[PDB]
C-alpha cells in the first residue's frame, strides 16, 4: 500500500505553501523530502534516496530550520538472465559515467560548489574577519587633533 | 520481529556501558568504581535505572508532549536504527544494504535533526545555543568521517558493510591506514560528544545543555542515546578499519574462531579506548575543537583520500 | 538435491563442470541470443543446451552423488556462495570429476 | 585539449582568488584594498582569454569527446565569445573608477566577474541542456553575488534578493523544461535533441512531451534577458543597484543569453511556436519601453527601459525566421552593447552627482559642452535617428522584418522609435534649450571611461561612412548556426 | 628553505597534508608512467 | 532494495520500543513518593558544501577500477577545486 | 575512448597528428618563445603595476607572472600544436624532412 | 595482577550483548528461513530464488 | 578473483536458465495469443493476432518501472 | 545510452537505429519510423494504447454482460 | 569578533629559578 | 504507472510554482517552494531515468542535487544577509 502513500508528500507540499507558522512549513518540508526519498527507494534508486536524506534533510532543511529558529518570520515478464550475472550497484553505474565520460558536467558542479563557498564567505562573513577586522584605520598627519572639531 | 534481538541486547549494552565507563575510568584513577550495588556493581545500571524511573517529576507538563517528548525518541531511534546495517558476523547483519555505508551517513545527518530539535524545544537560550554548538560540532566532524569512509571505501569495492569487513581478509585497514584509524577514532570521539572533545558536555553545561523538562526519562534517554551512539561509532572503527569479525587468521587449535566474539572483542577495545581517552586528556574548548575539525582532520582526511587513491591507482590494487 | 532438478544450488554448484563440458551448447545459445533476442528463434538451441546440461547433471548425480549431495547442500545452505565451503567443493571435485 | 581558453580564465580566477585572499589577509601588507589590483590584472585576464580563444579558433573543435558529450565550439560561438570577452572587458574599464571611489576591499568581486565570464564562455559553447543550465547557473550565481556586494546598504541587498529569486525561478523553470524535454528525447544533447525535434511542428506532428519541456525552457530564458512577458522586478534591479554593477548585468548576461537563445531554439527546435512568442515579446518590450521612457524619470531607470525597448528590436530578428533577420539581430546586439556601455559611461561621467533627475542632468551645455553633445549622441543611438549606428542596425532589422513580412511588428518598432524620439528631443532640449535646473558643475572621470565614449561615439557617427565590416561579421555568425 | 621549515613547524598538519597528498598526486603522475615495463 | 524492508519495519519497532521507554517512567511514581552567531551559518553552509563533495566522492570511491587513471585525475581536478575553495575559506578565516 | 580527430581539420599539411607533450613543447619556434615571453612580460608588468596601490608590488608581480606563464605557455602550446598538427601555417615541416 | 578483571566484567557483559545482537538476528533469521542470510544478495540471486521456488513446484 | 569465479559460474549457468525462461515465456506467450484471439473473436478485434514488433525487432512485452528494484 | 542497471540501457538500441538512420537521412519524416519505434521503446505508449483497447473491448463485453 | 585570540605559541619551556641558587 | 510517478511530481512542481506566485510577500516560503520545484524536477529526472532505462537521467539528477544544494546555500545566506543585523 506504500506505493500510493506519495499522497503524504503531496499534502505536505501543499502545507508548505499554505502555512503561516514557519515551524510547520519547515516540518512539512522535511516531510516532503522524507516521502520523496521513500519514493526514490520504491524505484530502487537507493543512492539517490540516501543523497536526498543527507544533502536535503541533514543540510538544506537544517539551514531552513536555522532560518526559522533564529530570524523568526512572525506472470508475463521474461527476465533476461543476462546482465544480471554482474549486478551494478547504483553508485558503481553512476561512477562509471560521471567521472570519466561526462566528467565536465562534474567539474562544472565543482565550480558551482566553489562559487557557493566563495558566496557564503563574501556574503555571510558579516564583517567578522579581515573583511572589516583589519582595523578601524587612522592617519595622524591629516588628523586635526583639536585644530578642527 | 528480530529487531527485539538487536534493540534489547543493545539496551542492556548501553545500560552496562554506563557502568563500564564509570568502572574503567575509575580503575584508571586508582579506585574501584560502582562496587557495592551488584556483586561487582553489575546491578548498578539497574539501580540507576530503577531510580530514574521512580523519581517523581518536578512538574508534570504532559501538555507539551508532541514537541520534545518524541525528540529524544527520535534521537534514540536513530542511534538504534543505524545498528541494522552493522554486521556482527558473516550473514549476521539484519539488513545487508548494498549502500550500507551511505545509509549510516544519512542516519548521522538525521541525528543532527535529533540534536537541533531536542535543543530548540528547550526554551533556554543558553541551552539552545549549546545544542546548536553541539550540532555544528557533530556535523563538522562528519565531513571528516565522510572522507575517512571514502578512504576505507576506495580500499574496498563497495559500500556494503559486510564487504568492507570481508575486504580485510588479507589485512585489516587498521594496519596500512593506521593514521586513518587515529583520525576516525578522534572524529568518532568528536562526532559523538563523549571525548576530549566535549565542551558542550563540560560536566555542568551538558545537563543544562539538552533540555529543560527532564522528568528523568529525558536524562536517561539522552545518555542511553549517547552510549548507543558510542557503541555504534565504536562498531564502525571495528568494521571499517579493524577486521569486522575476522580473526588474525593464525587458525589456532585452542581457538575455534567465532565471528561475533571477535567483533565483540574489537568493539570492546574501542569502547575501552573511548573510556581511557576520556580519563587521560583535557577538554578542547569547542573553539579549538571546531578549529581542529576544519583545519586538522579535513586536510589530513582529504590528503588520505588522494594518498590511498593514488597509491592504489598507480599499482593496480583497486 | 534429489533427482537432477536444475535448482539454483545444483546449477551454481556444477557450473565448473557445466563450463568444461556443455561449452559448445552454451556458446551456441549465446551466439543466437546475441544475434537476435527473440525467444522462439532458438528454442531449439535452448532445448539443446538444456538437454546436454540435464545430461551432465544426471551424470554428476549418478557418480559421486554423496559428495555432489553435500556440495549442493552447501550451495542451498549458503546461497550459491563459493568461499563459504571450499571443503565440500574440493571433496566433490577431487573424488570423480576434476 | 579544446577547453584551454575556458581553462585559462578559470585558472586566472583561481590564481587571482588565491592572490587576493592571501594578500588581503596580510598583516605585513596591512590588509590592503586588493580590488583595482585584482582589477587591471582583471581586464588582462579577460584579454589573455580573448587572445587564447581567438588564437585557437580553428583548433577549438579538437575532439569529438568534448563536442558530443560536453560542449561544442563553432564559428558562430567564436565570434560572439570574442565579443562577450570584449563586452566584459569594456564594462570593467568603466567600473575601475567606481572601485577607486568606493572603499572596495572586495577582491572577490573581480573574481566573480571573471567566473561569470567563464560561465558565460561555457554558456555560449554549451551544446547540452545539462551544460547550458549548469553554465547559466554559474554566470547568474556570480551575478547574484555582485548585486548584493554593498551589504551595509540594504538597497543593493534587497535588489539582490529580487534578482536572486528571479534568477532562481528562471534557472528552475528552464530546468523543469529540460526534464520534460529529456523525457521525450531520451538524451540531453542539443545535437541528439535536434534529430528528434527536427521539423517537429506540434500541429503537423504530435509532440506532447517535447512541447511541455520547450514551453518551460523558453519561459526561463525570457526571465534572464528581462523580456517584458517576464520583466517582473528586473527593471527594479537596474535602478536600485549603483550604476557600475547595473552596467555589468545590463550587457554581458543579456548578450550571453541572446547568443545561447539562438543556439538552443533555432537549431534544436523546429515548431511554429518559438518564433511567434518572441514576436509578441518584441512588440510588448518596445511598447513597454516607449511608454516607460516617457513614464520613467530617473536617468538610471530610463536607461534600463530604453535597453528593454532595444531588447525588443533584438528579439524581432529571432522572431523572423530568415537568416538575414538573425544577422540583423546580431547587428542590433553589437550597436546596443556599444551604446549601452557608452550610455552607462556618460552617467558614470557624472560620478559626482548623487542620485538625481534628468532636469538636474541638464545645464551641461555651458559646462562640459562636449560631454553634452556626447550625451545627445547616446540618446539618439537608441532613438533610431538615421545618422547614428543604431538606426542603421534598426533599418537592417526593419528591412529584414519587411522581407520576413513582419509589417505589423516592424510598424510598432518604427512607432516605438517615434515615441522614443520625442522624449529624446525633449531630453536634448533639457540638456541645452531649457530646464537647466541650477547650472550644476560636473567632475572628471578616468581616461578609460572617456575612451569608452571616444572609441564608441566616433564609431557610432563613423558607422555611416564605413558600415560594411559589421554587416559582414554579423551574417557570418547567423549562417554558422 | 628557511620559510619552508618555518611553515612545516608552525603548521604541521597542512604541511604534512600537502605531502601525504603529494605522495598521492605524485604516484600516479610519474610513478605510473614509469610502470610501463 | 529488497533488503530495505527490515529497516523499514525497524523504524516502527524502534518507535514502539522508545514509546515503551517513554511510558515506563510515566506510569510508576504515583501520589506518594546573542543576537546571531553567523558562524553557525558559515559552519552550516560549509558542511553542506563538503557533504556535497563527499556525495561526489562516493561513486568515484566505489568505481575506481573502472575509471582507470582518468576518472582518478578528473576527481583530483574536482578535488583541487575543492582545495582551492577550502584554502580560500581557511585564509579568509571561516574555520574558527 | 578518445581521439584527436578534429572538425575543420588538416587545412594545412599535418606533421605529427596528436603530438605528444615534451615534443609539441620542444617544437617552440623562436616566435612561440617570443609569444610566451611577451605574454609573461605584459602579465608581470600589469601584475607589478596593479600592485603599486596596495603595496603588493612584489607578490602581485609574482602572481601576474604565474598567470602569464600559464597563459603564454598555453598560447605557445596552441601555436606549436596547431603547427605540428595540420591547423596553422606550419612552415616547420623542414624539421621533419630533415630529421 | 588480575585486578583489572573487575573493570573488564562490565565490558564483558557489554560484549556478551553484542554477541547476542549478532547471533539473535542470525538464528532468528536462520529459523524463519532454513538457510543463513546471504550478504552479497544481488538481483541474480533473487531471480534464481524465484525460479528455484518455481522449480521445486 | 573470487568475484570473477562467481561471475564465471553465473555466466556458465546462464544459458540453461535462459533456455528455461525462454520455454516458460514462450508458453506464456502462446497462451496470451490464444487468449487475445479468444477475447477478440478474430472478426472485430485485432485482425492481426500478435503484431507486437512495430519494426524489425523483438522486445519483452511490457511492464511497470522496476520490479527487481 | 547507458541505463539504470547499465547493460547498454534499453532504448539505446532503438536510438542506435534512429541515429544510424539519421546519418545523411533524406528527412526526419522519411526515418520517422525509427524515431517512433525509438519513442515507443522509451515510453511504451504504443503498447499502452493497444492495452487500453484490449482492456476496453474485454471491459466492454464484461460491462455489457454486467449491465444486462 | 576582533578580540585577541589566545595564540598557543610561545617560548620553549626553560625552568627559570631565581638568582639565589648557589650563593644568594 | 510512470504517469502516477510523474503527474504527482508534475503537481508537486505546480505546488512549488503556486507557492512562488502567492508568497511574493514572505521569502522563506519562496525558497521552500524553490527547493520544492527543484525536487519535483529532480524526482522527475529520476523517475524518467528509471522509466526510459537510461543513466543520463540519474547523472543529471545528481548534478541538480549538488547544484540546487549550493543554490539553497547561497539563497539562505542571501536571506540571512537580507535580515541585516
Ligand atoms: C581604454 C583602456 C586604456 C588602458 O587601460 O590603458 C591606457 C594606456 O594607453 C594610453 O593611455 C595611451 C593612448 C591610448 C590611445 C588609444 C586610442 C584608441 C582608438 C581606437 C579607435 C577609434 C574608435 C574605432 C571604433 C590608458 O592609461 P592606463 O589605463 O594605462 O593607465 C592610467 C593612466 O595613467 C591615466 O589615464 C589614468 O591614471 C587612468 O585612467 C589609466 O588610464
Short mmCIF file of N, CA, C and O in Angstrom, two decimals, chain J residues 1-6 9-11 41-43 48, chain L residues 1-3 48-56 58:
data_model
loop_
_atom_site.label_atom_id
_atom_site.label_comp_id
_atom_site.label_asym_id
_atom_site.label_seq_id
_atom_site.Cartn_x
_atom_site.Cartn_y
_atom_site.Cartn_z
N UNK J 1 24.13 5.98 -24.36
CA UNK J 1 22.84 5.41 -23.90
C UNK J 1 23.02 4.38 -22.80
O UNK J 1 22.60 3.23 -23.00
N UNK J 2 23.63 4.77 -21.68
CA UNK J 2 23.77 3.86 -20.51
C UNK J 2 22.42 3.81 -19.78
O UNK J 2 21.57 4.66 -20.09
N UNK J 3 22.23 2.86 -18.86
CA UNK J 3 20.91 2.69 -18.22
C UNK J 3 20.98 2.60 -16.70
O UNK J 3 22.10 2.68 -16.17
N UNK J 4 19.83 2.41 -16.04
CA UNK J 4 19.78 2.33 -14.55
C UNK J 4 20.68 1.18 -14.09
O UNK J 4 21.44 1.37 -13.14
N UNK J 5 20.57 0.03 -14.75
CA UNK J 5 21.46 -1.12 -14.43
C UNK J 5 22.53 -1.16 -15.52
O UNK J 5 23.26 -2.17 -15.58
N UNK J 6 22.64 -0.10 -16.31
CA UNK J 6 23.58 -0.11 -17.45
C UNK J 6 23.13 -1.15 -18.47
O UNK J 6 21.99 -1.03 -18.95
N UNK J 9 21.69 0.17 -21.54
CA UNK J 9 20.37 0.82 -21.47
C UNK J 9 19.31 -0.07 -22.10
O UNK J 9 19.56 -1.28 -22.24
N UNK J 10 18.16 0.51 -22.47
CA UNK J 10 17.11 -0.28 -23.16
C UNK J 10 16.85 0.30 -24.55
O UNK J 10 16.85 -0.47 -25.52
N UNK J 11 16.66 1.62 -24.63
CA UNK J 11 16.27 2.24 -25.92
C UNK J 11 17.49 2.78 -26.67
O UNK J 11 17.29 3.36 -27.75
N UNK J 41 9.86 2.52 -27.56
CA UNK J 41 10.68 1.83 -26.54
C UNK J 41 10.77 2.71 -25.30
O UNK J 41 10.64 2.17 -24.18
N UNK J 42 10.97 4.02 -25.47
CA UNK J 42 11.19 4.92 -24.31
C UNK J 42 9.97 4.97 -23.39
O UNK J 42 10.14 4.73 -22.18
N UNK J 43 8.76 5.17 -23.93
CA UNK J 43 7.59 5.36 -23.04
C UNK J 43 6.62 4.18 -23.06
O UNK J 43 5.75 4.15 -22.17
N UNK J 48 0.72 0.73 -24.67
CA UNK J 48 -0.35 1.20 -23.76
C UNK J 48 -1.64 1.46 -24.54
O UNK J 48 -2.70 1.04 -24.05
N UNK L 1 2.17 3.18 -14.92
CA UNK L 1 2.48 3.62 -13.57
C UNK L 1 3.45 4.79 -13.60
O UNK L 1 3.57 5.53 -12.62
N UNK L 2 4.15 4.94 -14.72
CA UNK L 2 5.04 6.09 -14.89
C UNK L 2 4.27 7.40 -14.75
O UNK L 2 4.79 8.38 -14.21
N UNK L 3 3.04 7.43 -15.25
CA UNK L 3 2.21 8.62 -15.14
C UNK L 3 1.94 8.96 -13.68
O UNK L 3 1.96 10.13 -13.28
N UNK L 48 12.01 9.51 -14.71
CA UNK L 48 12.18 9.36 -16.15
C UNK L 48 13.44 8.59 -16.51
O UNK L 48 13.54 8.10 -17.64
N UNK L 49 14.40 8.49 -15.60
CA UNK L 49 15.57 7.67 -15.87
C UNK L 49 15.30 6.21 -15.58
O UNK L 49 15.85 5.34 -16.25
N UNK L 50 14.46 5.92 -14.58
CA UNK L 50 14.07 4.54 -14.35
C UNK L 50 13.15 4.05 -15.46
O UNK L 50 13.25 2.91 -15.92
N UNK L 51 12.24 4.92 -15.92
CA UNK L 51 11.30 4.52 -16.95
C UNK L 51 12.00 4.26 -18.28
O UNK L 51 11.91 3.17 -18.84
N UNK L 52 12.71 5.26 -18.79
CA UNK L 52 13.42 5.11 -20.05
C UNK L 52 14.57 4.11 -19.98
O UNK L 52 15.12 3.76 -21.03
N UNK L 53 14.93 3.65 -18.79
CA UNK L 53 16.11 2.82 -18.59
C UNK L 53 17.32 3.49 -19.22
O UNK L 53 17.94 2.98 -20.15
N UNK L 54 17.63 4.68 -18.71
CA UNK L 54 18.72 5.50 -19.21
C UNK L 54 19.40 6.17 -18.03
O UNK L 54 18.74 6.60 -17.08
N UNK L 55 20.72 6.24 -18.09
CA UNK L 55 21.51 6.73 -16.97
C UNK L 55 21.75 8.23 -17.01
O UNK L 55 22.06 8.82 -15.97
N UNK L 56 21.59 8.87 -18.17
CA UNK L 56 21.72 10.32 -18.24
C UNK L 56 20.76 11.00 -17.28
O UNK L 56 21.07 12.07 -16.73
N UNK L 58 19.89 9.99 -14.26
CA UNK L 58 20.41 9.98 -12.90
C UNK L 58 21.66 10.83 -12.77
O UNK L 58 21.87 11.46 -11.73
#
